[PDB]
Design a binder for this molecule. Structure first.
Ligand SMILES: NC(=O)C1=CN([C@@H]2O[C@H](COP(=O)(O)OP(=O)(O)OC[C@H]3O[C@@H](n4cnc5c(N)ncnc54)[C@H](O)[C@@H]3O)[C@@H](O)[C@H]2O)C=CC1
Ligand SMILES: Cc1cc2nc3c(=O)[nH]c(=O)nc-3n(C[C@H](O)[C@H](O)[C@H](O)COP(=O)(O)O)c2cc1C
Ligand code: SF4
Ligand code: FES
Lengths: 217, 62, 433
């Protein structure tokens, strides 16, 4: 339905221009490496990665992080505010340690994505916008993740977990709670985008270097 | 209320050309002040200039 | 004999993406063994004109979804230098629902993409290649960076790139969750550190592109095949598919199929053969089929009456009033709510609009509200035609082609499943009065 998130900023004691934020020296080295890729005089092009880098160090993006990126790149702060509010991967509010994103678009929904969503909700006791009181998990729904063949699928902090049933997602949650990391990929003995049984093509050994090369080359 | 004693305070006349207006004022015996018509100058617009490689015209937002 | 008529059975000796499933090593050592980075120097030394000709002879059409002829499009940067650097941008966004081809190409055959970038940049005279990848594809981007690193170490890119004398760089820039950033101009804007809002054309990227410099935007699949076409020749690539529909194609078969997957197949394969051979058919049998979206959510859906005899190429599906799109087949059986699926697609488009232009920003949200009411049956029949006209107003009046992709599924649903809408309205009125 409606977004729910506000696109204005109101200062809070935990999120104000004086909230402490600064890059680590290693992050400054990474910022220099990011900046070098773009042509000189076009330094702003680094707003998208560097902002992400800030979120990768802090967890979310306080207004002070946006101000720091704007000052480092010498870009007006409103431009960084525009970038932060435009893209949905930027967290302008704190999230849990593990950000569960379940796809509910049509190809993913046709393979019973609602079963996964309800299983997650009954396993965690939270809704599709809330954060668990332990501050470990946050559940939201997202549009197509590009893993439609493997639907139903879930994305957690850069890991795809695909071909899910309620039991698989519940045990992934259990493994994530007990201090372990689960292996990404399909959860049905597939480990690819292959057909679920038979491997209809790509069975013969791949051709060698120069097999089909044309004459005169 | 707003009171006036000026009988011509509301009179506005419309003319095709400045020459007609001047002729009317002259034949009616009124002192006149004429102002030449001001037109906006032709401006060179270019959408692509918003994305200049080295120019100052590049937009910081869109 | 020429002019084949039954396309859709090609063996693995003619598949470009031999590591589509990732069984083989995705690293450079594996790529070279399969047939990658072979005679790159020879291809580079042949010159941009020769490279451009091979693309032209092949008849290669853009695999990103529009199907614009690749050779002609690439030839737009064959102008002499004007003092500005030239760039090639690879579109790896892959935001279309139902589409997962570029993800597999990136994660399992990255060196194919890197070599395609090199050869395409040589053809265009480009200086470096920027690969804009989806932000959610973190592992795919990391595999891509590993591949680029081992190509730099082996001297396959960078300074002189070969025993060639041509300097070329490959950069990977990650997006941050925006489907609109798949559009070429919106992608260019997002690379330059702005909101992903599309530009108006003209100018086209070949005149004013990234950083204001001449640019060419190409789909990942379109670029990857570029070196295989050069090595084997355009004539060979053409020898597949109907006329103006040459080559092979990656298809993502998902939805109500027994074995959803992705597969390389000849271009003009019939839809039924593709679904029943590789995907295992529709759950409940072929007679359980209700509708098929042949090219991702942006294309209108077709009913079982058309699906049984339509070919999977550009012109054939255009004649079926839908379009090939991204070759992302989504199958829905007689057990699904056909209005709900279209409503979910419209909700996706409402959540993905950038908001720049009036017809998209307002009318897609309007269509979302109307469609959500249609799902329940709240509406009246006189609104259905009304909804049709709303889509017509949106289509062709927007800066970007996201408005077209929002208006076409609604038109397809109304064109083929109007009676279901009317009976839903009648039922809601019956139990509500
Ligand atoms: N790969 C994916 O995940 C997605 C794919 N799509 C596909 O994108 C298609 C429509 O996108 P568009 O960019 O609007 O296609 P388009 O019709 O605007 O043209 C496609 C290509 O041809 C170039 N071109 C066209 N006319 C030109 C001219 N006169 N001069 C120079 N260059 C020209 C364009 O610059 C562009 O590179 C849709 O059919 C859709 O299937 C849409 C969303 C996602
Ligand atoms: C809203 C929208 C999203 C798009 N997303 C992608 C995408 O993710 N990947 C892609 O290759 N093309 C995408 N396109 C189409 C691009 O215009 C296309 O890639 C570009 O014209 C070059 O593609 P080509 O190599 O097939 O010619 C999108 C188009 C629109 C309107
Ligand atoms: S059609 Fe939609 S996505 Fe495209 S420019 Fe207009 S508002 Fe943005
Ligand atoms: S619809 Fe779920 S990943 Fe594409």
């Amino acid at each position: 339905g409606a977004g729910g998130a506000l696109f204005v900023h109101r200062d809070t004691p935990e999120n104000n221009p004086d909230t402490p934020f600064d890059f680590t020296p290693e992050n400054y080295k990474r910022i220099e490496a990011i900046v070098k890729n773009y042509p000189e005089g076009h330094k702003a092009a680094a707003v998208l990665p560097v902002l992400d880098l800030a979120q990768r160090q802090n967890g979310w993006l306080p207004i002070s992080a946006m101000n720091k990126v704007a000052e480092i790149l010498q870009v007006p702060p409103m431009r960084v505010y525009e970038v932060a509010t435009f893209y949905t991967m930027y967290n302008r509010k704190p999230v849990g340690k593990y950000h569960i994103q379940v796809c509910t678009t049509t190809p993913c929904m046709l393979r019973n994505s609602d079963s996964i969503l309800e299983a997650i909700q009954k396993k965690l006791g939270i809704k599709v916008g809330e954060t668990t009181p332990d501050k470990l998990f946050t559940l939201i729904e997202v549009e197509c993740l590009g893993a439609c063949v493997n639907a139903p699928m879930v994305q957690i902090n850069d890991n795809y977990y695909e071909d899910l049933t309620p039991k698989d997602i519940e045990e992934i949650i259990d493994e994530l709670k007990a201090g372990k990391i689960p292996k990404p990929g399909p959860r049905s003995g597939r480990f690819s985008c292959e057909p679920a049984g038979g491997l209809t093509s790509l069975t013969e050994p791949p051709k060698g270097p120069g097999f089909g090369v044309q004459a005169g080359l | 209320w707003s009171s006036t004693a000026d009988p011509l305070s509301n009179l506005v006349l419309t003319f095709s050309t400045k020459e007609d207006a001047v002729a009317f004022a002259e034949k009616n015996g009124w002192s006149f002040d004429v102002e030449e018509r001001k037109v906006p100058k032709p401006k060179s617009k270019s959408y692509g200039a918003n994305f200049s490689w080295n120019k100052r015209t590049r937009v910081s937002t869109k | 004999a020429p002019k084949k008529t039954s396309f859709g059975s090609l063996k693995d000796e003619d598949r470009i993406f031999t590591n589509l499933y990732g069984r083989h090593d995705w690293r450079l050592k594996g790529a070279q063994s399969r047939g990658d980075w072979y005679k790159t120097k020879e291809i580079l030394l042949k010159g941009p004109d020769w490279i451009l000709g091979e693309v032209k002879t092949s008849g290669l059409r853009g695999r990103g979804g529009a199907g614009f002829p690749t050779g002609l499009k690439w030839s737009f940067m064959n102008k002499p230098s004007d003092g500005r650097p030239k760039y090639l941008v690879v579109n790896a966004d892959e935001g279309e629902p139902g589409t997962c081809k570029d993800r597999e190409i990136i994660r399992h055959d990255p060196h194919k993409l890197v070599e395609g970038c090199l050869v395409g940049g040589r053809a265009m005279g480009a200086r470096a290649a920027y690969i804009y990848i989806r932000g959610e594809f973190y592992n795919e981007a990391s595999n891509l960076q590993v591949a680029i690193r081992e190509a730099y170490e082996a001297g396959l890119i960078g300074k002189n790139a070969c025993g060639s004398g041509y300097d070329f760089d490959v950069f990977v820039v990650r997006g941050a969750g925006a489907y609109i950033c798949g559009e070429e101009t919106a992608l260019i804007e997002s690379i330059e550190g702005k909101q992903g809002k599309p530009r108006l054309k003209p100018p086209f990227p070949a005149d004013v592109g990234v950083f204001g410099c001449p640019t060419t935007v190409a789909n990942v699949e379109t670029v990857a095949v570029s070196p295989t076409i050069c090595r084997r020749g355009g004539a060979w690539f053409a020898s597949f598919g109907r006329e103006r529909n040459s080559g092979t194609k990656l298809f993502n078969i998902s939805g109500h199929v027994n074995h959803p997957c992705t597969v390389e197949e000849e271009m003009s394969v019939p839809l039924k053969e593709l679904i029943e051979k590789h995907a295992g058919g529709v759950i409940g049998g072929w007679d359980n089929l209700l509708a098929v979206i042949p090219g991702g959510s942006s294309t209108p859906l077709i009913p079982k009456s058309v699906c049984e005899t339509v070919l999977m190429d550009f012109d054939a599906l255009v004649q079926a009033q839908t379009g090939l799109g991204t070759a992302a087949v989504i199958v829905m059986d007689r057990s699904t709510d056909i209005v709900k699926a279209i409503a979910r697609l419209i909700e996706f488009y409402k959540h993905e609009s950038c908001g720049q232009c009036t017809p998209c920003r307002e009318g897609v949200d309007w269509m979302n509200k109307v469609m959500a009411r249609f799902v329940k049956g709240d509406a009246r029949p006189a609104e259905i035609d009304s909804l049709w006209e709303i889509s017509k107003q949106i289509e062709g009046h927007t800066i970007c082609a996201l408005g077209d992709g929002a208006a076409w599924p609604v038109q397809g649903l109304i064109r083929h499943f109007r009676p279901e809408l009317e009976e839903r309205m009648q039922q809601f009125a019956l139990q509500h009065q």
